[PDB]
């Protein structure tokens, strides 16, 4: 009855990828009943601990000493003599975790280890998971061509099956966001409106609001800040009216709305938005998002270029060059309007430096 | 800011 547990853990992972929580809870229960009467295969035990971890990552996406850091504890104490697909799962899942912690280098390191084992992965849907997650981190690193390379592979496999809508939406996010990085907002809007339509079909509040956020990033790119300010606002109430008011990623939408309202020269409204966003980053214990709201504040409110510089260095040390570029670009532009062309030059150069670093 | 990819 040892393969009987392995088969059930596979089924468990099938349902996790399908975002069927009721089935995932059914399989997790059956597995835990089965482990009671099995004979301590340490690999089977680790397969179980990895699936628990992956199951928890699903649950934390759908609803935000957490169960996760306790589960991650169990995983690293048994990283001894790994081989085959279990080693692949180990590194893939570990890279996922590290990505959610803003540990981009760690995550890419883990993902590269998993990638070496890709030929062991018979399941096409499993390979698609890998390609999507890899594409995602490449996008966050502004590795646009690498991201596009992986994301096409994933979304082709997902679209070849049926109930992978959630992943298909997310792949549409990645592709669209890549086209944006290439200054094609008009090429990116189709993919986001497509995602928006599918997310309303399955009534996923999170995905709906992230579509608005991604669409607002287009208007913002087209300097249509009115329309951009709308998209951001509605996506924020989406997250808030549906139990996502404490998801870290709402800070993204707050941050860009704060930027947009300041660019609309609605100074006072812009203050009542950087505010909610500064305190929320404090509350959710996200140092990286807090320091991006500081940058906005020090820029449009304070002109404390010194702090601006200190934040830019921080974000570079954090391997978030894309945010370095975007923020230095906000600074450079704003000072250009204020005709402080001298220091406006300083930030234009920083933009050049970040763009160069991204290319290496 | 990066778009939402998840």
Residue numbers in the entry:
A (entry chain A): 7 to 70, 77 to 372
B (entry chain B): 1 to 6
Give sentences copied directly from the paper behind this entry.
Proteins of the RRNPPA family are the most frequent pheromone receptors in Bacillota and use small secreted oligopeptides as pheromones. While most members of the RRNPPA family act as transcriptional factors through DNA binding, Rap receptors are specialized members that exhibit the capability to develop their function by interaction with specific protein targets. Binding of the pheromone produced from the propeptide, which is named Phr in this RRNPPA subfamily, induces Rap receptor inhibition. Our results reveal that distinct maturation processes generate multiple mature pheromones, which bind to receptors with varying affinities but produce identical structural and biological responses.
The structure revealed similar architecture to other Rap receptors, with an N-terminal 3-Helix bundle (3HB) domain (residues 1–69), followed by 7 tetratricopeptide repetitions (residues 95–376) conforming the TPR peptide-binding domain, connected by a linker of 26 amino acids (residues 70–94). The putative dimerization of Rap3T is due to the interaction of the 2 TRP domains that hide a large surface of TPR7 from the solvent. All 4 peptides bind to Rap3T in the low nM range, but the internal Phr3T pheromone has the highest affinity (EC50 = 5,28 nM). As could be anticipated since all the structures show identical conformation, the analysis the Rap3T-peptide complex revealed a quite similar peptide recognition for all of them, with a core amino acid set critical for binding across all peptide versions. This core comprised N226, a conserved asparagine residue in Rap proteins that anchors the main-chain peptide and up to 23 other amino acids interacting with both pheromone side- and main-chain. Among this set of residues highlight the role of tyrosines Y151 and Y225 with several contacts with peptide residues in positions from 1 to 5, or D338 and Q182 that interact with the N- and C-terminal peptide ends.
